[PDB]
């Protein structure tokens, strides 16, 4: 929880890039390569980094990536999770992993989302690509770039689409209930071991009979209105598929809470 002097941050590698980049650095004030490793995020967006840091300063959970401080143009310094993105990890260790492990990860993501809910924080971005793996036994939620704190008196706000709840698609509405819908897509992703051919984009594009890279918002809404949903992945226990279907109830108030999904996933693992 400190200001990291830029001169002491020794660049190791680029971890990711998007809309924005995350760099693996060694914080070496001594200058003898004994210092701890950190992940440094760097970028009209002064308002957005101000928004993101205010949220991250306030989160303290073993299931949410730890905010470590700042460095300087504002840079955000976070803990580094050595096993990287869940999407990469599941694809590389598929043969060595099992349904038990995916239930353990599902339970941990659900605990972090319960915590975010307790802070009236909407994550919005939740997807396997922003879940990070600390160790074989532990994952954490990352990417707070689109996160938002709800007002005290309003449980929603108005702002890829394959993780979004229908109200987000049709009315630009986001809430903790739309985060539950996205969590259902994450459960789907975990159970495919993040396989590219069965990704939410690949599967929804097949279901919609699309012959293009970019989906049509109107067609996805039509498919969802019909009651169509992502199928149960081959590796998927029937119990988990039922939980996904609940997260995907068309009305937000009819979706389960993370506090209700959580013990169920925990038990399936245990
Ligand atoms: C798959 C990319 C990757 O390996 N990324 C990554 C690995 C390890 C790690 N530790 C900490 N972070 C981190 C820290 N703060 C923010 C972010 N932001 C994002 C993570 C994942 C997707 C998008 C943004 N990551 C990483 C990141």
Ligand 1 pocket residue status of 38, Cβ below 6 Å: no
Check: CB of residue 185 under 8 Å from CB of residue 162: yes
Ligand 1 pocket residue status of 143, Cβ below 6 Å: yes
Ligand 1 pocket residue status of 109, Cβ below 6 Å: no
Check: CB of residue 154 under 8 Å from CB of residue 120: no
Query: Which residue has the least CA distance to atom 4 on ligand 1?
Result: 84
CATH number for 81-270: choose from 1.10.510.10, 1.10.10.60, 1.10.1660.10, 1.20.1630.10: 1.10.510.10
CA pair distance 185, 143, nearest whole angstrom = 17
Query: Which residue has the least CA distance to atom 19 on ligand 1?
Result: 143
The owner of tokens 């051919």 is: 197
Ligand 1 pocket residue status of 165, Cβ below 6 Å: no
Q: How far is the CA of 130 from the centre of ligand 1 (A)?
A: 7
CA pair distance 24, 11, nearest whole angstrom = 6
Beta bridge partners of 208: none
| Documented resolution in Å | 1.8
Ligand 1 pocket residue status of 142, Cβ below 6 Å: yes
Burial 100-134 (b: 16+ CB within 10 A, else e): ebbbbbbbbbbbbbbbbbebebbbbbbbbbbbbbb
Q: How far is the CA of 22 from the centre of ligand 1 (A)?
A: 6
CA pair distance 122, 131, nearest whole angstrom = 15
Check: CB of residue 179 under 8 Å from CB of residue 105: no
CATH number, span 1-80: 3.30.200.20
Q: Which two structure tokens, joined as six digits, stand for 219?
A: 């067609």
CA pair distance 14, 37, nearest whole angstrom = 13
Q: Which residues of the chain form CATH 1.10.510.10? A: 81-270
């Amino acid at each position: 929880p400190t200001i990291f002097e830029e001169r002491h941050l020794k660049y190791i590698s680029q971890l990711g890039k998007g809309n924005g980049s995350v760099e693996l650095c060694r914080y070496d004030p001594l200058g003898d390569n004994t210092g701890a490793l950190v992940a440094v995020k760097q970028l009209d967006q002064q308002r957005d980094f101000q928004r993101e840091i205010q949220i991250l300063k306030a989160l303290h959970s073993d299931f949410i990536v730890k905010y470590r401080g700042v460095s300087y143009s504002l840079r955000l310094v976070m803990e580094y999770l050595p096993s990287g993105c869940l999407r990469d990890f599941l694809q590389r260790h598929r043969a060595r992993l099992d349904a038990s492990r995916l239930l353990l990860y599902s339970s941990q993501i659900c605990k972090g989302m319960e915590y975010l809910g307790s802070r009236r924080c909407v994550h919005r971005a939740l997807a396997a690509r922003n879940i990070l793996v600390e160790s074989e036994a532990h994952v954490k939620i990352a990417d707070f770039g689109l996160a938002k704190l709800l007002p005290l008196d309003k449980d929603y706000y108005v702002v890829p689409i394959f993780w979004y709840a229908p109200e987000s698609l049709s009315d630009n509405i986001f809430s903790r209930q739309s985060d539950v819908w996205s969590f259902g897509v994450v459960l789907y992703e975990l159970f495919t071991y993040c396989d590219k051919s069965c990704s939410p984009s690949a599967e929804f594009l097949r279901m919609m009979g699309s012959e293009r890279d970019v989906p049509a918002l109107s067609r996805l809404l039509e498919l969802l209105e019909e009651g169509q949903r992502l199928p149960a992945p081959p590796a998927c226990p029937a119990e988990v598929h039922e939980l996904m279907k609940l997260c995907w109830a068309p009305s937000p108030q009819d979706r389960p809470s993370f506090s209700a999904l959580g013990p169920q996933l925990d038990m399936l693992w245990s």
